[PDB]
Every structure is written in structure tokens, then in C-alpha cells.
């Protein structure tokens, strides 16, 4: 079972309303475990899953210290970029940052990431080799030269390949029951007459973890990709996920159609058929 | 476990 650790950082300027908004959230695979909100009263990194609540005050005091340092860099960054693009001080702008690491089924480093966007577009990203940078424009090229001269990539590499994966492993061990579990999908199908010569067949997958899943319809064993309505995998609210797939079936043809479900929590892919 | 330090753009 491959795993990842990821932090997502959102910074938004609020012209004439004071300091910019800053949200930090941390995830292990598809489970959120911490948060920081600039507008909340605690002004601290806060637990968002029971298993991390067992870390003591040194852990929390340290994460709070580092999350405040991130916020402060993002506060200076909004003004730097604004100057780089010669932008007015009246418009609201958006900065986003994402970093983390993935490990494979052996729990060993597979890849590390550090990406950065300005107003929803790629601004600067660390390449896969963890030594070079991908700059989206001249403003970005200016950030690149700065980060190159301060040896930022080398510092990131030591974090993503070392510390990042070490703490991922610690987290996987500590939140074993939550994070090392798989919840196979609970499946069912519904049939709803739409008219008198056709009907909607819906295939459901519920209460599954993790979120990755393949849910497809076939007619005589042939893919119906183009003829399927497929919703985006959505969160149930309790740590599990849901998804459905539907097709409009001509009268008397229910038996030509099969619903296919692939998921980590299933020992063998399921083949369902209304009958 | 957050990284540190964090350099400006």
C-alpha cells in the first residue's frame, strides 16, 4: 500500500480589511490530520483526527511555531508578486503552495514535490530530480534565481527524502487503525423508469477508503465510457468516500449491461448485473 | 511534520 504526506497552503490578500487570510491543512493519504486558520482564535496548529491527539505539547508547540513562520513568508510573498506583476493594491490575489512526499509499498521514498501557484496558475515548481526549478514566466525566473543562489532545492531535497518520509512512517505507525485500514466499497444498483422505452441503471459504491476507485459500465463486455454519467468521488463526512455511475438502458436490455468495480479493499474486482 | 525554514519568492 503506497502512501503520501501532503501540506496544502492557501493565502488570500484582503485589500482594506487588514491581514491576508492564511489556511494550512495537512493530510496523510486521504485523511486530514491538522489545520491552521489565520482567522481562528487559538492561533495554533490544531488536530483534525483523533490519532494525532496523542502527540504532546512539544509536537504541537513546534508545529504552531513552523506554521506561523510559513504564514509570515506568505504575507511578504503577496506584496513581492504584486510588485513583480506591477499590480494594483486594490485587487484580491491568491497564492497556493503544496509540498510533501510519497513512499511505495515498501514504505520507502518514491517522490517528493514542492509546487507554487499565483492566482490559480503554475508559478514555480521543484522538478522530480529535486535539483532544478520549472519557472512559468520572467517573474518566476526571478524567484528561480533567488532560490538558486540560496540553495533552496538542496534544502528541500534533504527534507522530502529524509524528515518527510520519516514522519510519514511515524504517522502510519501511530494512526495504524485509521490510516492503515482499507474499507471495501458497499455496492448496490438502482433502476428508475424514465420513460416507457428506457430506464436509468445506477451503480453505487459507498463507505470506501481510500478514495481511489474504478467504477465502469459495460454492454456485452464493451466499454461504455462515452455513454456513462460518472460523478466525482465525494466525501461522506465520516472519513469515507462515495461514487456512482449510470447509463440509460433501452427496454429489455438490462441483462446486456454489467457494472465493474475495482478497489483496494476488494480481493477481486466485482462484476454486477441487474437481474 | 512541517518543514523549516521557508524562503520568500
Amino acid at each position: 500500500g503506497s502512501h503520501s504526506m501532503r501540506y496544502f497552503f492557501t493565502s488570500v490578500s484582503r485589500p482594506g480589511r487588514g491581514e491576508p487570510r492564511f489556511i494550512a491543512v495537512g493530510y496523510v493519504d486521504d485523511t486530514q490530520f491538522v489545520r491552521f486558520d489565520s482567522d481562528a482564535a487559538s492561533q495554533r496548529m490544531e488536530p483534525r483526527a483523533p490519532w494525532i491527539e496523542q502527540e504532546g505539547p512539544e509536537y504541537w508547540d513546534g508545529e504552531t511555531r513552523k506554521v506561523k513562520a510559513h504564514s509570515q513568508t506568505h504575507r511578504v510573498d503577496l506584496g513581492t508578486l504584486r510588485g513583480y506583476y506591477n499590480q494594483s493594491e486594490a485587487g484580491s490575489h491568491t497564492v497556493q503552495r503544496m509540498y510533501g512526499c510519497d513512499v511505495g509499498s515498501d514504505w520507502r521514498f518514491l517522490r517528493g514535490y514542492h509546487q507554487y501557484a499565483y492566482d490559480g496558475k503554475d508559478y514555480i515548481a521543484l522538478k522530480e530530480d529535486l535539483r532544478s526549478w520549472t519557472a512559468a514566466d520572467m517573474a518566476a525566473q526571478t524567484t528561480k534565481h533567488k532560490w538558486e543562489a540560496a540553495h533552496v532545492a538542496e534544502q528541500l531535497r534533504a527534507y522530502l527524502e529524509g524528515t518527510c518520509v520519516e514522519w510519514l512512517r511515524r504517522y502510519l505507525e501511530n494512526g495504524k487503525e485509521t490510516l492503515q485500514r482499507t474499507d471495501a466499497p458497499k455496492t448496490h444498483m438502482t433502476h428508475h423508469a424514465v420513460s416507457d422505452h428506457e430506464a436509468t441503471l445506477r451503480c453505487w459504491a459507498l463507505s470506501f477508503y481510500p478514495a481511489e476507485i474504478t467504477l465502469t459500465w459495460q454492454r456485452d463486455g464493451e466499454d461504455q465510457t462515452q455513454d456513462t454519467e460518472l460523478v466525482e468521488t465525494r466525501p461522506a463526512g465520516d472519513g469515507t468516500f462515495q461514487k456512482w455511475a449510470a447509463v440509460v438502458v433501452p427496454s429489455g436490455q438490462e441483462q446486456r449491461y454489467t457494472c465493474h468495480v475495482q478497489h483496494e479493499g476488494l480481493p477481486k474486482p466485482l462484476t454486477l448485473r441487474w437481474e | 511534520y512541517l518543514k523549516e525554514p521557508v524562503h520568500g519568492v
Binding site: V12, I23, Q96, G120, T190, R234, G237 | -
Partner: protein, 100 residues
């Protein structure tokens, strides 16, 4: 600057069973920028105690949030989600269907 319109799904945490406690969700995703206004309605009126997840975003930078509240479904009552965002001329209203 980039403007991406929210995809909206309105659904319950558990399969709807009349008279049994549950959670009504509104999932908004794929949008940008992040200012967004999301309300849950019961027969047209705004539900008051509505919570939401912490702001986060996908690989293409688009944001996503879950809005949710406790509820007990009934044969009668109608529920909906009403969303506002800079990409929408007016509030988009999506009705809850127990089969979706």
C-alpha cells in the same frame, strides 16, 4: 485572472431512511478563486447550524469544500444547496434527490 466555476453535489452521508438521523452534505469543488457562499435549505429556508471542512485544493489548483448539517429525512421535506461565486450570474440552486 483565472475563474473556474464550482461543481455542486447535494447528498446524504447515509442512504436516506425516513425518521432516521443522518447528515445532509453539499460538496463544492473545482472552483477559483476561493471566496464562495454556500447554504443548505430546508423547504426554502436557510438552515442555521451549517459547518464546513477546511479549505483545500486539488492538483489543478482548484478549491473544494464540504458543507454539512445533521438532519432527519422525511417523506415531505425538501432540501437543497444554494451556491454563489464570481462565475455565477445568480445563485445556483441544486435540489436534493435521495437517489443521487
Amino acid at each position: 485572472m483565472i475563474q473556474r466555476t464550482p461543481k455542486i453535489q447535494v447528498y446524504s452521508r447515509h442512504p436516506a431512511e425516513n425518521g432516521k438521523s443522518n447528515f445532509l452534505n453539499c460538496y463544492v469543488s473545482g472552483f477559483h478563486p476561493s471566496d464562495i457562499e454556500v447554504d443548505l435549505l430546508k423547504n426554502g429556508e436557510r438552515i442555521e447550524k451549517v459547518e464546513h471542512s477546511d479549505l483545500s485544493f486539488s492538483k489543478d489548483w482548484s478549491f473544494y469544500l464540504l458543507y454539512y448539517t445533521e438532519f432527519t429525512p422525511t417523506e415531505k421535506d425538501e432540501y437543497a444547496c444554494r451556491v454563489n461565486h464570481v462565475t455565477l450570474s445568480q445563485p445556483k440552486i441544486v435540489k436534493w434527490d435521495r437517489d443521487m
